[PDB]
Amino acid sequence: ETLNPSARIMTFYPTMEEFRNFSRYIAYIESQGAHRAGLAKVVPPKEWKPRASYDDIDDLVIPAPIQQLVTGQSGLFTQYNIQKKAMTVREFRKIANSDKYCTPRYSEFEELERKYWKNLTFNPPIYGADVNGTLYEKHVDEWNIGRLRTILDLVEEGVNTPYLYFGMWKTSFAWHTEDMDLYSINYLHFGEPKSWYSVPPEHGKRLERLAKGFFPGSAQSCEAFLRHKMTLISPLMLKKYGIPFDKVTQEAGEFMITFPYGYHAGFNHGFNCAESTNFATRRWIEYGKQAVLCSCRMVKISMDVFVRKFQPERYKLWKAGKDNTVIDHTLPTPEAAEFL
Ligand SMILES: [Cl-]
Ligand SMILES: [Zn+2]
Ligand SMILES: [Zn+2]
Structure with a gap:
């Protein structure tokens, strides 16, 4: 496709008028080829804020903080989670900003990225991950992660509910696509940046083949x-084996969109808070039908409801196991037609 052939991460700056319709805007960014990178950044208008202040969340409970223990060498690592007892944002912030766990001194991102890949196996940090909740005020109607109102609402597992992530320096998210290969939206509420790596959906099978070659025991089991x-x-390991990827840093007040079958990973620069949920478009339905799921082991959605409503003509063929549709990763969502 002639739209974003380079498959690079695109950044969008919608006006207040453009921003109001979430689903229409996702269709627009696809028309521009944003989905080819597997990840896109959306900077909201300056006037828009989801909450007036974050000064009242000190006693918010993180029910399951996880100590992230990383094992490995030469750019290949396995992350083990150790669930710790519940803690408040106040206690978490104290640990995150402490001498033991705070961000190192650095000039450029390249320096901090080097420190991360050099030290990720030392001094395990605590990630205040998967907190059920939202930091959005009730009246916020634009890009409200708690109520995006996409076709995924036809489900109601709990993949439509928002989650909070309290990060600290060196906390990480491993290589993965979304459950059922869905889209995701991530808003960084406040704090230090979050760095991301992405592999374009058209090259995802190459990452999987690499990953299978490196962890053959894990591949056999699941x-x-x-x-x-x-x-x-690590990016160096990706580069060594010719896996195309891109990187981007998300700063406080910015949104990241992940696209169906877009592999992503990354880390937190320091104390911060992000809000996340999954969503869908008509384009996702085929990805949902073809998703390879964890067999050992997990979030599973019955596709029946989506095929009946959006592909009635293919329902009999698909239930009989005769729907041999091949996904073209470069094609935009059908809702994008108005922009094409
Ligand atoms: Cl705070
Ligand atoms: Zn994710
Ligand atoms: Zn598994």
Whole structure:
């Protein structure tokens, strides 16, 4: 496709008028080829804020903080989670900003990225991950992660509910695509940046083949082992084996969109808070039908409801096992037609 052939991460700056319709805007960014990178950044208008202040969240409970223990060498690592007892944002912030766990001194991102890949196996940090909740005020109607109102609402597992992530320096998310190969939206509420790596959906099978070659025991035990979210592969290792990828830094007040079958990984620069959920478009339905799921082991959605409503003509063929549709990763969502 002639739209974003380079498959690079695109950044969008919608106006207040453009921003109001979430689904229409996702269709627009696809028309521009954003989905080819597997990840896109959306900077909201300056006037828009999801909450007036974050000064009242000190006693918010993180029910399951996880100590992230990383094992490995030469750019290949396995991350093990150790669940710790519940803690408040106040206690978490104290640990995150402490001498033991704070961000190192650095000039450029390249320097901090080097410190991360050099030290990720030392001094395990605590990630205040998967907190059920939202930091959005009730009246916020634009890009409200708690209520995006996409076709995924036809489901109601709990993949439509928002989650909070309290990060600290060196906390990481391993290589993975979304459950059922869905889209995701991530908003960084406040704090230090979050760095991301992405592999374009058209090259995802190459990452999987690499990952299978490196962890053959894990591959034998589960076809979809990358869904366990424990595998960390450095950009140098990707470059060495010709896996195309891109990187981007998300700063406080910016949105990241992940696209169906877009593999992503990354880390937190320091104390911060992000809000995340999954969503869908008509384009996702085929990805949902073809997704390879964790067999050992997990989030599974019955596609029946989506095929009946959006592909009635293919329902009989698909239930009989005769729907041999091949996904073209470069094609935009049908809703994008108005922009094409
Ligand atoms: Cl705070
Ligand atoms: Zn994700
Ligand atoms: Zn598994």
